[PDB]
Amino acid sequence: MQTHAARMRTFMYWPSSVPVQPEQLASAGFYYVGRNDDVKCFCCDGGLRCWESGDDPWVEHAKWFPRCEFLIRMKGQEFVDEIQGRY
Ligand SMILES: [Zn+2]
Secondary structure, three states: OOOHHHHHHOOOOOOOOOOOOHHHHHHOOEEEOOOOOOEEEOOOOOEEOOOOOOOOHHHHHHHHOOOOHHHHHHHOHHHHHHHOOOO
């Protein structure tokens, strides 16, 4: 699940009702595990479910799994710090 294309392919059977797009999930390192709306990050193995309207996957990534190596490398410690309430 190291590549964007491999993560995107797992969303081929992603439910239509979920108000979060596969493109944005896969960019933030998530892939659909083929269960409800459960996704896991390829890097930290952080699991996320119950995706609501207006959810930004990068924000959810930094909110619940701030120590993820991929999240830090892509978004940076400053972004992670902000999401954790540190300005
Ligand atoms: Zn992660």
